[PDB]
Design a protein around this ligand. Structure first.
Ligand SMILES: *[C@@H]1O[C@H](CO)[C@@H](O[C@@H]2O[C@H](CO)[C@@H](O[C@H]3O[C@H](CO)[C@@H](O)[C@H](O)[C@@H]3O)[C@H](O)[C@H]2NC(C)=O)[C@H](O)[C@H]1NC(C)=O
Lengths: 28, 51, 234, 51, 102
């Protein structure tokens, strides 16, 4: 359960499509 | 001469290997002693203990 | 003591002129000649400053100043004659530091977030208290004073630069704000936008000017001392 | 001249040259966060069976 | 006549506060002002005494954001490699800060 504490950051700041291609195999 | 360096920690605490990736794109590697509430200082953020 | 020479003593009405020579004005800076010219330009008084004074007797508010011993280092008020930086007048919004005792003063410096501030009283308007009001008195008619009218706050070492990219300047200001979560407003200049505040606090941290408007402060900096043979430094 | 030399300032991962590196006193101001905290709400309480 | 009632509510196993202390969060911060001889003019032998509170080398004496940090000189660089042209070694003063930002 690694965690980190936050300081004074330097946080920075159109069309888009997903278009899936394939799927692999896992469950459990 | 043959020279040895020593340190008497005299304890054993779990630790992990951690890679950091600053959102600007910068990445920093470090070995934090996450078993203890250690505070590795780098850039702006600091991590600390784990489970 | 004296960088080149001991400043001449002339028994007062004399306007010391410009010298094109580089090694001639340094001992004049030793004489505090430039600060007298500041009076003639803004205070409008022909008071010769620092007879026998030089740089061997001038004292600053700090009890011990290592930089004062090394007179080779250049002072912010002395960088005005040489042309690197300039001191300006004082605004009504600008206020005094109650640190030192303003007894028999006419000109004292105060580096700020924006620039360097010099304050003036009248010749004969003796400064016998820390307040802004100057008081008339006949005891200061004589111009002889061991830097009594010239007290300088701060320990500042000046030197020429090579400027930095605007982006490099931007890194310091953002990181300085991160280093100071509690500091929000400084001298009225915004440092970080916060809520309502209390006004009175003397604030003293190390600072550095990189040729940009916003001053840069530090608490975990590592300085470096290197000297090289430069024709300007001769 | 009797001087230490030029100053080079490195403050956390960069190298910066000073025009006039010095110390001085300024006026600052301090902010304060005043928080009034309290909660209270209605709840539903019932008994189905008691043993 | 009058009376007095005493109501009990719970039974538990506590113990009295014999002492009391607070524990902040320490971060080890350190600076280094790097003089060299004839430029800071420090002595050939490093002064065994150290004023851990004033530090007149950097702005005389004021508040140190560390709680009674230590002091000391360091080993020396000398030559054109470090630039101030003295073959003699150099003295370097160091700080140590314990800090609790948040
Ligand atoms: C107070 O006012 C004085 C005159 O009003 C002023 O003297 C002026 O100083 C400047 C210095 O830049 C001279 O400018 C010329 O000389 C310098 C070198 O000495 C050159 O670098 C310049 O390019 C220019 O050629 C002015 O000539 C000189 N004025 C006169 C009439 O000689 C003082 O400097 C002012 N002092 C303060 C403290 O405000």
């Amino acid at each position: 359960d690694i965690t980190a504490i936050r300081g004074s950051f330097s946080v920075n700041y159109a069309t888009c499509t997903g278009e899936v291609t394939n799927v692999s195999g896992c469950y459990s | 001469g043959i020279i040895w360096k020593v340190s008497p920690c005299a304890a054993w605490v779990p630790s992990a290997v951690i890679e950091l990736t600053m959102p600007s794109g910068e990445v920093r590697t470090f070995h934090p002693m996450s078993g203890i509430p250690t505070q590795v200082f780098k850039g702006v953020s600091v991590t600390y203990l784990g489970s | 003591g004296p960088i080149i020479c001991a400043g001449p003593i002339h028994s007062k009405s004399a306007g010391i002129p410009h010298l094109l020579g580089y090694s001639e004005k340094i001992c004049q800076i030793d004489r505090l000649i430039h600060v007298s010219s500041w009076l003639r330009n803004h205070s409008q008084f022909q008071g010769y400053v620092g007879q026998r004074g030089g740089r061997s007797q001038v004292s600053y508010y700090p009890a011990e100043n290592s930089y004062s011993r090394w007179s080779g280092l250049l002072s912010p008020c002395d960088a005005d004659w040489l042309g690197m930086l300039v001191v300006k007048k004082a605004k009504g919004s600008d206020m005094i530091v109650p640190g030192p005792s303003y007894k028999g003063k006419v000109l004292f410096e105060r580096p700020t977030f924006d620039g360097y501030v010099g304050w003036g009283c009248g010749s004969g308007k003796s400064r016998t208290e820390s307040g802004e009001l100057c008081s008339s008195d006949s005891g200061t008619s004589s111009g002889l004073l061991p830097s009594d009218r010239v007290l300088w706050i701060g320990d500042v070492a000046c030197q020429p630069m090579t400027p930095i990219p605007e982006e490099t300047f931007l890194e310091l200001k953002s990181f300085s704000q991160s280093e100071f979560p509690d500091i929000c407003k400084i001298d009225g200049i915004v440092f970080n936008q916060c809520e309502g505040e209390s006004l009175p606090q003397p604030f003293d941290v190390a600072w550095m000017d990189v040729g940009h408007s916003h001053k840069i402060i530090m608490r975990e900096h590592k300085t470096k001392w290197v000297q090289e043979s430069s024709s300007k430094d001769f | 001249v009797h001087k230490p030399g030029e100053v080079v300032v490195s403050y956390g991962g960069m190298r910066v040259r000073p025009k006039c590196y010095g110390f001085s006193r300024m006026m600052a101001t301090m902010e304060v966060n005043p928080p009034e905290q309290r909660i209270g709400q209605c709840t539903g309480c019932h008994l189905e069976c008691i043993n | 006549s009058k009376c007095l009632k005493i109501k009990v509510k719970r039974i538990n196993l506590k113990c009295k506060k014999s002492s009391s202390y607070f524990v902040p969060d320490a971060r080890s911060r350190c600076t280094s002002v790097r003089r060299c001889r004839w430029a800071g003019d420090c002595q050939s032998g490093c002064p065994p005494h150290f004023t851990s509170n004033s530090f007149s080398d950097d702005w005389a004496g004021k508040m140190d954001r560390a709680g009674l940090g230590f002091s000391g000189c360091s080993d020396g660089c000398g030559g054109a490699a470090c630039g101030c042209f003295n073959a003699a070694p150099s003295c370097i003063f160091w700080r140590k800060w314990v800090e609790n930002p948040h």
